Amino acid sequence: SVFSERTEESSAVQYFQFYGYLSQQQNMMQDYVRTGTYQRAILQNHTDFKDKIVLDVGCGSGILSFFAAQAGARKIYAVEASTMAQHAEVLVKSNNLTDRIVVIPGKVEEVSLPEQVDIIISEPMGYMLFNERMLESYLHAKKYLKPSGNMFPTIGDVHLAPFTDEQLYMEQFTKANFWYQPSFHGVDLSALRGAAVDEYFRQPVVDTFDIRILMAKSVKYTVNFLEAKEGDLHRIEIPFKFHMLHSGLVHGLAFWFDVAFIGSIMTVWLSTAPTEPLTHWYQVRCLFQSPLFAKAGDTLSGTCLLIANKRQSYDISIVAQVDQTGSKSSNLLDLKNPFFRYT
Amino acid sequence: SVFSERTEESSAVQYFQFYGYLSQQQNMMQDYVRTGTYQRAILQNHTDFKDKIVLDVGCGSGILSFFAAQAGARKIYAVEASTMAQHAEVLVKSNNLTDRIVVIPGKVEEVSLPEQVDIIISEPMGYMLFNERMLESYLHAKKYLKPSGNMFPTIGDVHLAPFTDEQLYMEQFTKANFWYQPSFHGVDLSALRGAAVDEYFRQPVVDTFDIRILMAKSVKYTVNFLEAKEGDLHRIEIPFKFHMLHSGLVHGLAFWFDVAFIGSIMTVWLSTAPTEPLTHWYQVRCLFQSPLFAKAGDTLSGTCLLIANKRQSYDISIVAQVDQTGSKSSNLLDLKNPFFRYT
Amino acid sequence: EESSAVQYFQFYGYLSQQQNMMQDYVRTGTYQRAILQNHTDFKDKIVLDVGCGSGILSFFAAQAGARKIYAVEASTMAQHAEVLVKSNNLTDRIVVIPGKVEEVSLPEQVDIIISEPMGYMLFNERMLESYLHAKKYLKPSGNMFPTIGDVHLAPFTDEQLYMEQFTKANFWYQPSFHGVDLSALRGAAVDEYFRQPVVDTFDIRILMAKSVKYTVNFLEAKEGDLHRIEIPFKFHMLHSGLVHGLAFWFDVAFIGSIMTVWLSTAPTEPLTHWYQVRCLFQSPLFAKAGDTLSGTCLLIANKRQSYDISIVAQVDQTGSKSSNLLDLKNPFFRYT
Amino acid sequence: SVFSERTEESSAVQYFQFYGYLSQQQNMMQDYVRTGTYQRAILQNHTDFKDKIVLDVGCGSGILSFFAAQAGARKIYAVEASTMAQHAEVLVKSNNLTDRIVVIPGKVEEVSLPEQVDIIISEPMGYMLFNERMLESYLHAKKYLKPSGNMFPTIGDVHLAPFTDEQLYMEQFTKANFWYQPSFHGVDLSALRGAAVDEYFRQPVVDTFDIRILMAKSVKYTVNFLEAKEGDLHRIEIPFKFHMLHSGLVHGLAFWFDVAFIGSIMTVWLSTAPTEPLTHWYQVRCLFQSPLFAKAGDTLSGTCLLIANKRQSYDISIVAQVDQTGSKSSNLLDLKNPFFRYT
Numbered sequence A, B, D: 001s002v003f004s005e006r007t008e009e010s011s012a013v014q015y016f017q018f019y020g021y022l023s024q025q026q027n028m029m030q031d032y033v034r035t036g037t038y039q040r041a042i043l044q045n046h047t048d049f050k051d052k053i054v055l056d057v058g059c060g061s062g063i064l065s066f067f068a069a070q071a072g073a074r075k076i077y078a079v080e081a082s083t084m085a086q087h088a089e090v091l092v093k094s095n096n097l098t099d100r101i102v103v104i105p106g107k108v109e110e111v112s113l114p115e116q117v118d119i120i121i122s123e124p125m126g127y128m129l130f131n132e133r134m135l136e137s138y139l140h141a142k143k144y145l146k147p148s149g150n151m152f153p154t155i156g157d158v159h160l161a162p163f164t165d166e167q168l169y170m171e172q173f174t175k176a177n178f179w180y181q182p183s184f185h186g187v188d189l190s191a192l193r194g195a196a197v198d199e200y201f202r203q204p205v206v207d208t209f210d211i212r213i214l215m216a217k218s219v220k221y222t223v224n225f226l227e228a229k230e231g232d233l234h235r236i237e238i239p240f241k242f243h244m245l246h247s248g249l250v251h252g253l254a255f256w257f258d259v260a261f262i263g264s265i266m267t268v269w270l271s272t273a274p275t276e277p278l279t280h281w282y283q284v285r286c287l288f289q290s291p292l293f294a295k296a297g298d299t300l301s302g303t304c305l306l307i308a309n310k311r312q313s314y315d316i317s318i319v320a321q322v323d324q325t326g327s328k329s330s331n332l333l334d335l336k337n338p339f340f341r342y343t
Numbered sequence C: 001e002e003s004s005a006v007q008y009f010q011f012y013g014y015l016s017q018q019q020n021m022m023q024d025y026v027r028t029g030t031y032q033r034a035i036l037q038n039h040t041d042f043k044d045k046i047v048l049d050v051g052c053g054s055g056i057l058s059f060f061a062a063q064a065g066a067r068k069i070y071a072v073e074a075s076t077m078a079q080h081a082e083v084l085v086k087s088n089n090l091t092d093r094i095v096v097i098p099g100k101v102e103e104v105s106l107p108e109q110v111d112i113i114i115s116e117p118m119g120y121m122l123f124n125e126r127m128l129e130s131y132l133h134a135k136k137y138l139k140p141s142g143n144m145f146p147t148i149g150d151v152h153l154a155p156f157t158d159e160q161l162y163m164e165q166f167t168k169a170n171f172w173y174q175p176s177f178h179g180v181d182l183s184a185l186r187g188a189a190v191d192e193y194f195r196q197p198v199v200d201t202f203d204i205r206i207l208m209a210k211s212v213k214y215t216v217n218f219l220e221a222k223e224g225d226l227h228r229i230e231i232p233f234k235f236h237m238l239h240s241g242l243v244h245g246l247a248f249w250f251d252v253a254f255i256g257s258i259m260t261v262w263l264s265t266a267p268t269e270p271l272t273h274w275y276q277v278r279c280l281f282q283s284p285l286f287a288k289a290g291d292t293l294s295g296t297c298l299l300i301a302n303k304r305q306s307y308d309i310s311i312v313a314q315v316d317q318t319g320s321k322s323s324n325l326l327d328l329k330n331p332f333f334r335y336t
């Protein structure tokens, strides 16, 4: 199948084991911004759902299908690959919606749906939008989408901005310098210090931060889910040119994302920006191996290349240069294993 | 091999991947009670190592092998299945111990050793002692042990005691009651309440606690590593009969463990008891879904049954009754998915 | 029901209960203040005291110069009031008439009716109906003391109380209480506990929105108006969080010719023997600051001299709704 | 029925409304002394129950019937007049005991049983044993008892003893003197002081106390439920002669009670004495209007007469005199309206 060909089994097992927990669905559901914004988007665009056929990709508990039901959908196919699928069936039955919602256990790449749909709904966004690579299943599901059908969310924006955080940068060495001692219980650990430094810097940092550490307005990379194909997400090249608003040391790049629901009545935005209330996605920061000095007015240019890997995640490659000085720094990060710093 | 027939590919991959990180090694090493107590056990029993052949099962960073070298071992075979093996060899070289520590990459069930050993060392203890199932590899390694050789640790004591903690119980009940809502954003979730409670209470609670919450003297279950066979750890049946010292609600059972290093010069104990300084193992508590009332003088009897599973952990069944009244509780826990409650 | 009335009037026949009421200085002092400072509404007037008890209000009316006070009391306290009238040398002015105001015959119409008919949440005990019934003896230009009553409602957050009640219900969750499985009743137990209005006081900071007010004008209203009392509400949430229920209190106003005097049982005011009342939701509602919480509190009069209370509340922005039933006759007195 | 004939409608309605609440059943159930002693009494006398026909008078939640089922009864008729009867039916089914326990809604005086029973069980004890007059229903149920049938409880002991408690006594005047003031908001209340004193002294005081307030060994009055007839409980005359152990002022009589379960295997006692752990019955004290001075060695003689009233309670008449001095005191108390003093 399409899913299995792009994912090591070991990862998929863990992934769907993870989403089989009611506690995780609860964790997502209790994020008021998320759930409220999806509900707001679906109900305020009721003309996009009333008497329509809907597909819920990865329905989990089923919450979005029930929202689609509130909006008047004629028939909702709710596909779910984890065991959560049975619980969804339970909720469908207990909410007297069996005539309207059909739970389909399995992967959307592998199940067969009987008819074309007017609209697809889903919540496939991970850290940095793309983590978990579920966006590809979302795009894959358009094989069941009627031409001129719609996608909720309709588009996704990834934002990048350079940041300064001396303490975060210093933290890595403070942790790694554990190994820089000649007699830990009589053992010289120092030979592993460089390896420890490298290991820490390959971890993207998941947490939030004060927006005051940001040194330039973000660069935006847009995925239009109506236009994009699954293959578009295998290699994501995000060039950037930052016009520095502040003078100082740039320690790395900060990441967050927005998604938009573009309905017939209105467009509704779900934002994970550090200027907005915190969500369960937080934000993500990728350090440069070496800080770059920049003056306000200078340009910081380079590339963030996201390469999809077989663990349902991405290898992140960042190259940055201060154009005015030629000072250069890069980093390569493994997004499947982020460091959760939030407290 | 013995390891692969009894272990899922997915679980083993994540396990040995997990232990491939220097940061996790740093976390274990920075547990001073653990590391210091091991070093104390090995050095104070230097005669059990002097000019001896040693096997270190799962050497990780190699720290125990270095202790064995400090104590005068002539040759140490250090077996390690994760990529950490590469790092351990780096340390063996930078510490000029190549003539004495031989790193052998691979699983102890699969590698070939050149000779039998006089003593086996390892740190195979997990949560509730048994989690991760490394004790089976530790016991499996005895095929390389000479007829009158020794094991460090030599024995392991599991301790059980009932506790009262209304707040923890109500905490979990508070979490589970989310699924009690009849109108979460208009959706009746209640049909799943029972499912939510089951899932939450199946999580052993990992943390520490004040000893005064204990309602009776602990019961001890001893595993003798010198005599026990690997197969013995597939199904562990722990009967218990507590003589209640205090009247009140028993909300569940608390678990911790001791291990002993029985050397020629001394017996050295490593304890994770709540009366002792905290370790990275903390303590473990298994909640009853419903508490049992008992009076001082009553006896609380039952069985704790541990079933080894394919995810390198245990299915826990706890059945307990207040003998005088017939008040009974039965519970099942999934040790692989614990609740980390500390700070 | 005869059964309810017997207990009611036996309860009010005890001197200790009168003492308990009298020793509420806010109540007694505020009543006295309302009557004396509007003394011209009583001076040389005819008064009816509905449910006079010990007679204290009739005595206030006498102090204000009333020419004649008919003090109606159905409990045996009526006999104690007459003792006080004699020992206070007011036989020429206070006439105790034992019996129910619905059943006695009065010699003349009155200029003003006084009474203390307020129960928990104002309406408990359904004595307001007797008060309004008594208006048959009221002159066209007559007055009522109190004249109006305001019921105040506000959403509140109080996790401690909610878990307190759930902890109690959790008893019925046991699969083996002395070997007996009680759990099949847990749903019934929760329902019962959560049907208890909680009588006590609280810190005003638990309130999550400015209160909503429902006013009953005793001068205008009919007895019949009180069998079904429908109180709609729309709260504009000031704080984000879990709404665990609705808090209730009441004010009454004595609108006299000289001044208006207010008696308040609000949590911002000194405590009275009425405290305040809270109705818990079985499931709390999450609301954000700025959201709207709308719904209805419906009071249906029953034959046990009280009301069946249905509270339905909804967060308008999410559709999260909670429904609840309270038996006002059996409250939980939490105050200590 | 005999029940409707001895109780005003108003009282019975309130009584059975009161007992229709689960919280009330719960409070009785959570009295461990009570519930546990009944369970012990029934299980330890299993030969009095195994394959027998049982009558449970006023089963409430049904708990005693379930104890009888545990002891092996072939059949239990569980009679209950409040709406609790319904909830009892639910528990019998959910506990898979419909073939052995038959819930019979109604008053034991009014329902019909299909057959005679071997043993009657009940918990009919009120304050000072006799309050609520349920013992008459219990004795009435003997119309269904086989000759040589048994009753659990089998006997009831009411204990009386003189006590000294100056503070309790003074409390009464402190409370009544509220009315002894010439200008309560301008009103002279004093004419009612005597009535207030009266009202307070007519209330039996419910609470517990230090046994050291007792001034003589108690006198015991026994009801043998096997022999007694309903009518025996309408008028209960308890003569007493106390031999004073301590010198001082006697302020009244303290009351408590025991019941005994006289089975074929053993006798089990349920005691509410102030020397025993507290129960929901506490103890009861009836004050004398005027205290009596007694010397150690003096005799305090008199009568406690309990007269049943239609409010399902008793009018208590107590007359006592110190024989050596002739000083005399009386009190008339209404057990229906006690003062709950316990704090």
Ligand SMILES: CCOC(=O)C(=O)CN(CC[C@H](N)C(=O)O)C[C@H]1O[C@@H](n2cnc3c(N)ncnc32)[C@H](O)[C@@H]1O
Binding pocket: C008, C009, C012, C013, C018, C021, C050, C051, C052, C053, C054, C055, C056, C057, C072, C073, C074, C075, C077, C099, C100, C101, C102, C116, C117, C118, C119, C120, C125, C127, C130, C273, C274
């Ligand atoms: C929570 C406290 O509740 C209260 O405020 C009251 O009910 C006030 N209480 C006490 C107030 C008292 N007057 C005082 O201020 O001293 C009501 C009194 O009115 C009597 N009564 C109730 N119905 C009655 C009826 N149809 N006909 C005649 N009498 C009635 C009652 O027997 C009682 O004596």
Ligand SMILES: Nc1ncnc2c1ncn2[C@@H]1O[C@H](CSCC[C@H]([NH3+])C(=O)O)[C@@H](O)[C@H]1O
Binding pocket: A003, A015, A016, A019, A020, A025, A028, A029, A057, A058, A059, A060, A061, A062, A063, A064, A079, A080, A081, A082, A084, A106, A107, A108, A109, A122, A123, A124, A134, A137
């Ligand atoms: N290819 C796939 N096919 C089906 N379900 C999937 C797939 N990939 C991920 N999922 C599920 O999609 C869900 C993403 S989480 C969103 C769940 C739910 N719609 C909610 O908003 O609460 C998880 O339950 C995953 O198990």
Ligand SMILES: Nc1ncnc2c1ncn2[C@@H]1O[C@H](CSCC[C@H]([NH3+])C(=O)O)[C@@H](O)[C@H]1O
Binding pocket: B003, B015, B016, B019, B020, B025, B028, B029, B057, B058, B059, B060, B061, B062, B063, B064, B079, B080, B081, B082, B084, B106, B107, B108, B109, B122, B123, B124, B134, B137
């Ligand atoms: N069957 C096995 N064979 C070899 N190594 C193993 C096996 N099971 C676990 N391990 C490794 O053993 C280690 C357990 S942690 C103990 C490491 C070291 N003794 C120290 O105290 O620092 C990890 O590095 C695991 O990867």
Ligand SMILES: Nc1ncnc2c1ncn2[C@@H]1O[C@H](CSCC[C@H]([NH3+])C(=O)O)[C@@H](O)[C@H]1O
Binding pocket: D003, D015, D016, D019, D020, D025, D028, D029, D057, D058, D059, D060, D061, D062, D063, D064, D079, D080, D081, D082, D084, D106, D107, D108, D109, D122, D123, D124, D134, D137
């Ligand atoms: N005459 C009567 N007939 C039937 N039930 C009665 C009668 N009098 C009292 N009861 C009930 O008897 C119970 C008294 S206490 C509850 C006793 C129960 N067996 C237990 O141990 O928990 C109440 O449920 C009353 O409603």
